[PDB]
């Protein structure tokens, strides 16, 4: 859910990028 | 070749001051590209009417920054006299390049 | 969190290092609850400020990578 940092959504919602949502 | 910018605020003036720089840019030789109206950048900002606590019914304004472009094809020594010395911008601003 | 420095204020070590001279007494006050604990600074009980007074806090290896602040309670009724 929009509340799990270790998730695509979570990361997205948080407005961040990372290992679960890298910059391409 | 020479490019010219036209910012300012009241699009009522800027339009004229610009348009002038064509009816007078053709008489000085080379042809020109009609006053081209590029997009407008806007400055909107909201404020809470009351001077205290009333997050509702507040009020926001705008600050329309009109821009306008136009350009002469060939740089005549003729035109130069006009442009360079015909500085008549009430509240206008102009940038020139190549 | 500091990985290139240690932000540990100088008027500390300064007063700790000069004290390092053969190692004498210890009673030493400060308001740097914001600095870090330096290794070997054990035995040097440093009364820390909290806004009210200076807590006569001992200091030992167990506690090091910490701030003298963690050791000072800011509020009351813990």
């Amino acid at each position: 859910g929009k509340g799990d940092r270790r998730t695509r959504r979570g990361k997205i919602w948080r407005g961040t990028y990372g290992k679960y949502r890298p910059r391409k | 070749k020479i490019r010219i910018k036209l910012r300012g605020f009241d699009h009522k003036t800027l339009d004229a001051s610009a348009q002038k720089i064509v009816e007078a840019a053709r008489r000085s030789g080379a042809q020109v590209s009609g006053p081209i109206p590029l997009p407008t950048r806007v400055r909107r900002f909201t404020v809470i009417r009351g001077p205290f606590k009333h997050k509702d019914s507040r009020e926001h304004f705008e600050l329309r920054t009109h821009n306008r472009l136009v350009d002469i094809i060939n740089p005549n020594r003729k035109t130069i006299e006009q442009l360079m010395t015909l500085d008549l911008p009430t509240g206008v601003e102009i940038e020139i390049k190549t | 969190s500091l990985k290139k420095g240690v932000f540990v204020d100088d008027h500390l070590l300064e007063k700790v290092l000069e004290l390092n001279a053969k190692g004498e007494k210890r009673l030493i006050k400060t308001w740097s609850r914001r600095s870090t604990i330096v290794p070997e600074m054990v035995g040097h009980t440093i009364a820390v400020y909290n806004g009210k007074q200076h807590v006569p806090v001992y200091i030992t290896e167990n506690m090091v990578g910490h701030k003298l602040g963690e050791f000072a309670p800011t509020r009351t009724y813990r």
Binding site: - | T46, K55, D56, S57, R58, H60 | -
Partner: protein
């Protein structure tokens, strides 16, 4: 030769072109049924041709830009009509009767201050 109609519908501008022939349909550089794969509303944009009856006749070449895929399908459904309405002074009998002409003025409205969503008003305590 070229048969164009201005496709526009809710922040969606579609460019419609009609070339007699097969029936192939293109949009922004792709096969119609491919650029809209999944959308069961795709086959809806071509519905105008299906009542003029004249489908196996115009290799339509479109290019819609701006908006949402579905919105685009709307822009298109208007171009395919506005385009062919031109090259058929009699095909007016459908763009007016079979309601195929309206920009749908229907569009998102400004979010008023003090209304989470331009209308949805915040909660309420009272107590």
């Amino acid at each position: 030769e070229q048969y164009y109609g201005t496709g526009r519908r809710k922040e969606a501008v579609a460019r419609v072109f009609l070339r007699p022939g097969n029936g192939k349909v293109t949009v922004n550089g792709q096969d119609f049924n491919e650029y809209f794969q999944g959308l069961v509303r795709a086959v809806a944009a071509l519905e105008p041709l299906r009542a003029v009856d004249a489908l196996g006749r115009f290799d339509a070449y479109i290019t819609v830009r701006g908006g949402g895929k579905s919105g685009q399908i709307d822009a298109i459904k208007l171009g395919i009509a506005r385009a062919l309405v031109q090259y058929n002074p009699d095909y007016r009998a459908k763009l007016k009767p079979l309601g195929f002409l309206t920009r749908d003025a229907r569009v998102v409205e400004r979010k008023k201050y003090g209304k989470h969503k331009a209308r949805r008003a915040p909660q309420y305590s009272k107590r």
